Design a binder for this molecule. Structure first.
Ligand SMILES: O=C1C=CC(OC(F)F)C=N1
Ligand SMILES: O=C1C=C[C@H](OC(F)F)C=N1
Ligand SMILES: [Zn+2]
Ligand SMILES: [Zn+2]
Ligand SMILES: [Zn+2]
Length: 459
């Protein structure tokens, strides 16, 4: 029970306005045949065009919302909408394109999917709120068959070309006209009451409904993300490495140790309240400070209310010492805080569009994160970049240009000239820092934080 059986029943009530007279009793096997895709043999790796909710969640990077509206059924133009915001009009003879035949429309579909997905996934999962025309339009741009590899590399094939009779992955599909072996899921099969807009609007105020196909496609994918990552959370599902995941996570740990260590040295807080992940470890194990942990899982719906995390009777006195919120997203941070907050607006291959302003950050695990809100940081200031080190000035062991920087807080810089070891460490730290910031992380600190207080730790 890993794939969706083609003999599973498909509820057809959502299809009967576009397809009147559709049988109530219907399987995926009969639906696939009705879509024009009947095959005589089982294809290994491709037993069904449709997939389970569990398989869809494992392949969230491949999700592309897709809707087809009857612009005016082989006789009328169709408006094809995608969650990328694209609307294509196909004639049978927020981007909006004018009516063109299927032979040219299909080339655009392949280019758009290939550019959106080449750095995200080995496939496409069309997320539908199926009413009929989207399923019956697939035969015009989709070909199916045995699982194949790219003609130019080892990746699985996602596109086919009728011009050359060859197959390609998303990276090598330039000029290709057919989407090959796509996957799809119909959100209507999950058991909803009422239409798409009414279910979507219960959880999201960011996506509107201009009544165009891309608006519906965006809403469909958003509702699917809400169901699978907002109200339901599975942190046991692992996702493949597609970018700088390892360097980013390594940078996060280095920056956290640096910032916390410096805050403790600079302001000598007697207690640190570490609020967040129940699996957290002391990031500065050698520090004198009374380290107290408070469990809070990463909030995937709305940011935590500080009143619920702190009040309702623990050290109790969160006002004493300093509070550390490392990716623990609250509505309004207290003035005595050290904070790392993911900015959901960031554009990257790890950060997928989410629900109600939030984003789905996928790095080893999937984390739906509530919308970035600048008002959460009103009691704090942006943490400036700095590098601090009390380690001995000793090279041990890469060419060298002398470092001159006011933010290299070391004994050698206090002494007048940055040593080679501290220059190498500073440059490595700066690279890690910039990697973390560019990934979408933002750092904030209590207003009294001043790196001038670190110089006297060298006496
Ligand atoms: O008759 C068919 C055709 C396709 C299919 O699943 C997958 F290959 F698309 C299952 N049965
Ligand atoms: O503990 C974590 C790790 C990552 C995360 O995502 C972040 F971008 F919002 C949230 N909490
Ligand atoms: Zn390839
Ligand atoms: Zn939405
Ligand atoms: Zn040095």
């Amino acid at each position: 029970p890993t794939h969706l059986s083609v003999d599973t029943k498909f509820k057809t009530e959502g299809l009967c306005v576009d397809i009147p007279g559709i049988p109530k009793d219907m399987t995926y096997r009969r639906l696939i045949s009705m879509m024009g895709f009947k095959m005589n043999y089982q294809v290994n790796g491709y037993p069904n065009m449709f997939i389970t909710r569990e398989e869809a969640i494992r392949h969230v990077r491949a999700w592309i919302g897709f809707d087809v509206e009857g612009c005016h059924g082989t006789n009328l133009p169709l408006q094809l909408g995608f969650s990328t915001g694209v609307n294509l009009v196909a004639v049978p003879t927020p981007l909006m394109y004018k009516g063109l035949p299927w032979n040219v429309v299909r080339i655009k579909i392949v280019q758009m999917l290939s550019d959106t997905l080449k750095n995200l996934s080995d496939r496409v999962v069309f997320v539908l709120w199926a009413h009929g025309f989207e399923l019956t339009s697939m035969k015009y741009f989709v070909k199916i068959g045995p699982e194949r590899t790219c003609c130019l590399c080892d990746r699985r094939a996602t596109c086919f070309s009728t011009a050359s009779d060859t197959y390609a992955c998303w990276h090598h599909s330039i000029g290709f006209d057919y989407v090959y072996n796509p996957f799809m899921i119909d959100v209507q099969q999950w058991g909803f009451t009422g239409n798409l807009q009414s279910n979507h609007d219960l959880y999201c105020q960011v996506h509107g409904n201009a009544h165009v196909a891309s608006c519906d496609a965006i809403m469909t994918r958003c509702l699917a993300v809400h169901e699978c990552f907002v109200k339901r959370v599975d942190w046991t599902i692992e996702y493949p490495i597609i970018g700088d995941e390892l360097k980013i996570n390594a940078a996060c740990r280095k920056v956290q140790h640096m910032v916390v260590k410096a805050a403790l040295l600079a302001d000598k807080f007697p207690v640190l309240h570490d609020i967040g992940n129940p699996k957290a470890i002391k990031c500065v194990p050698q520090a004198d400070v009374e380290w107290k942990f408070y469990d809070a899982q990463p909030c995937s719906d709305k940011a935590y209310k500080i009143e619920e995390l702190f009040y309702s009777y623990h050290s109790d006195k969160f006002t004493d010492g300093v509070c550390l919120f490392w990716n623990c997203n609250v509505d309004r941070y207290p003035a005595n805080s050290i904070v790392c907050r993911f900015d959901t607006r960031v554009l990257s291959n790890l950060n997928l569009p989410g629900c109600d302003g939030g984003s789905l950050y996928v790095n080893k695990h999937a984390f739906h994160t509530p919308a970035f809100d600048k008002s959460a940081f009103v009691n704090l200031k942006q943490l400036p970049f700095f590098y601090y080190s009390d380690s001995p000035c000793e090279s041990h062991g890469i060419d060298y240009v002398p470092l001159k920087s006011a933010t290299c807080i070391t004994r050698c810089n206090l002494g007048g000239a940055v040593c080679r070891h501290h220059a190498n460490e500073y440059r490595l730290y700066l690279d890690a820092y910039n990697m973390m910031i560019s990934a979408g992380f933002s750092l904030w600190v209590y207003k009294q934080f001043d790196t001038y207080n670190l110089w006297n730790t060298f006496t």
